[PDB]
Each structure stands twice: as structure tokens, then as C-alpha cells.
Amino acid sequence: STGLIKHTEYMEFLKSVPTFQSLPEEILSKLADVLEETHYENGEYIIRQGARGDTFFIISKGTVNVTREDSDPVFLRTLGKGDWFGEKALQGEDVRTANVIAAEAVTCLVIDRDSFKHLIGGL
Ligand SMILES: O=C(O)c1ccc(CN2CCC[C@H](O[C@H](CO)c3cc(Cl)cc(Cl)c3)[C@@H]2c2ccccc2)c([N+](=O)[O-])c1
Questions:
Q1: 42, 17, 38, 20: which is closest to 29 by C-alpha?
Q2: Is 97 annotated as a binding residue?
Q3: Record-annotated residues binding 3',5'-cyclic GMP 2?
Q4: Which candidate among 6, 22, 57, 119 keeps its CA 20 to 30 Å from the CA of 69?
Q5: CA neighbor of 67 nearest in space, from 105, 42, 97, 88
Q6: 68 is in an annotated binding site
């Protein structure tokens, strides 16, 4: 099935990221069952500084720029394949502290707070 082919792709990708390769096979499989892909185009804002957030993003394709207004926005850093962002939104109500903008065609694997709490809660 197409769901199985996507699950196999996500498993291979997670096993290529050292931080996630430390997880047991059982947990990676359950995480790959719930992750979904979101695609972004060059210049598209993935996250905005000051917005409320509920999603965590792992980059599976492309690069993003992280920027913020200190009072025009300043450049903070570029992230790419295997990096992630937005994790504070998984721990509870969160206000984003920086923009994350696609710097080319991007794909992220995403999970929201409700799905993350359900996954962790079942362990
Ligand atoms: O300094 C420290 O205290 C510190 C603490 C933690 C980490 C690792 N941690 C960093 C944030 C992303 C991810 O965690 C989120 C939950 O926040 C997460 C999202 C999904 Cl989908 C699924 C799982 Cl299991 C977890 C990752 C991680 C945490 C645990 C397992 C695997 C990956 C790091 N670090 O390596 O940077 C530094």
C-alpha cells in the first residue's frame, strides 16, 4: 500500500537521524504511523514569531532560514535535512520565538501536541 511505502520511507529517514536512531524499533514504528508530511515552497513561512503553536517539524527535504524581529527581522541560522524545530510546542501552550521560512522546496515530517501526548502517554 501507499501508506506502507510512506511508513518505510519515514522509518529509513528517522534511522538516518542520530537523535532518533537511539529510539527502539517499536517506538520508531509507532512514530512513523502518526507522522505526516507537509510541503513548503521557497519563501513560505512555516512558523511565525509570536504565533501560538502546536506542531513539531523534522526536515526531510530542503533547508529553512530561522529569523526574528528584535524590536526588520535578523538572521539566526539555517537548518537542513535531519534538523528539527518547534519542539517547545509539544510540551504545552507555546508562543513561537522565531520565524522559520523555507529557503527552497521543503518537506517536513510533522506531529502535533495532541498526537505526541497520545504517543508518549501510551509508553
Ligand atoms: O538539552 C537537552 O535537554 C536535550 C533534550 C532532548 C534532546 C532531543 N530532543 C530534542 C527536541 C526534538 C526531539 O524531542 C521531541 C520532544 O521534545 C520528540 C519528538 C518526537 Cl516526534 C518524538 C520524540 Cl520521542 C521526541 C529530541 C528527542 C527526544 C527524545 C527522543 C528522541 C528525540 C536534545 N537534543 O538532542 O537536542 C537535547
A1: 20
A2: yes
A3: 77, 86-89, 96-97
A4: 57
A5: 97
A6: no
Work out the number of other CB atoms within 10 angstroms of the CB of residue 58: 24
CB atoms within 10 A of CB 119: 15
User: How far away, in angstroms, is 1 Cα from ligand 1 center?
Assistant: 30
Q: How many domains does the chain have?
A: 1
CA-closest candidate to residue 43, choices 100, 97, 87, 119:
100
* Listed resolution, Å: 1.4
Domain of residue 79: give its range: 1-123
Approach to solving: X-ray
Closest CA to 81 of 18, 30, 25, 26: 18
